[PDB]
Symmetry: C8
Subunit: 62 residues, 8 copies
């Protein structure tokens, strides 16, 4: 509530990384730096999503 | 705070359909176990028999 | 409201069973298998409704 | 509250009983069986209302 | 939330009683019997309001 | 669950205005201490100087 | 949200005071007396804002 | 949450600082004084965002 942010960070630990990304207030973005990942980890969850499942999650988050 | 409402579902019965999910009212198939474990951090994961998926789809519409 | 499901399972322990049914997001459905009943029991309540009272509950849930 | 039900059961312990009744999502119903009363007691409150006060409560619940 | 009732019971312990009354979902009603007062005391607050202050509370509850 | 949002207010300063309240955005005077004690069961009771009531009225509008 | 008030008190402890002010339900007001500051401190937060930052906070609170 | 403020403070601990900034009710502002940072830290989260990631966060906070 208080942060004005709803969403989550996502990444894969699989063979081909896509780095960290996030859905923030329904907007998908890439995150370039680990400082930002740790900053957002204080206010939103951070989960794992395989590279092959990102397309379907995108569709559901639309 | 996740901006996600829904659940993962699978059956432990004879004819598995793997893992699927309802995410914000959209049904999807899940290809990898990593994704199942990731979403298990933020949404419930329940069992649904293959025979009951059609009725749950109607209710989730 | 993390599950995206509001409702309840219902059944009777009376002489003439109607099996398990549910109201899920205002939609009434039949449940065929016990696995599904136990799955939904993790996220929604499960109560008893006599066969003779189902008609009135349907009217109120409309 | 995940049941999708708002309301209460009501009855009187006074001289002229009207059995159990309920308001469920703003709809008043009669309850025919004690099994149903016990089922709804798992998800909604159960209170006492004198027969003389039911008319005024109906006006307020409209 | 669960009861589908928002409001309060009110009465005075002053010299001229007006009995018990209630605001239920923005509707003011009189309560005739103590059974009903005790029933609603399970789900809504019960406060004291002097007879001379009822008019102003009515205006604010409109 | 009371269906009431607001607060009682009074001053302990030199020029008392007795007790007043904002109830659901309506300002009222309270005539009897019984009513003050009744509403103290369901809403906060705070102090407001007589000089500040005009600005609080503007904000509560 | 029992008090019907959303907002905060603000002041600076810097060299040039602007006294205490508040945002109450999106309306900015000045507070003249400490009694009122202590009264509102029972229901809303009270924070520090430098005189030079008030203009930007006003813009964000608009 | 009674402050009427949703958002967060952000800064970087990386090589090129941009000082402290904030999103307050969907409005981005610069913060000039540390007193204001400490004041808002009483009511909103304070996280780290790399300078390289600010552009994407602005897009998501729009």
């Amino acid at each position: 509530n208080v942060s004005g942010v709803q969403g989550f960070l996502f990444h894969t630990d699989g063979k081909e990384s896509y780095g960290y990304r996030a859905f923030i207030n329904g907007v998908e973005i890439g995150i370039k730096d680990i400082e930002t990942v740790q900053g957002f980890q204080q206010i939103i969850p951070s989960i794992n999503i395989s590279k092959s499942d990102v397309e379907a999650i995108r569709k559901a988050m639309k």
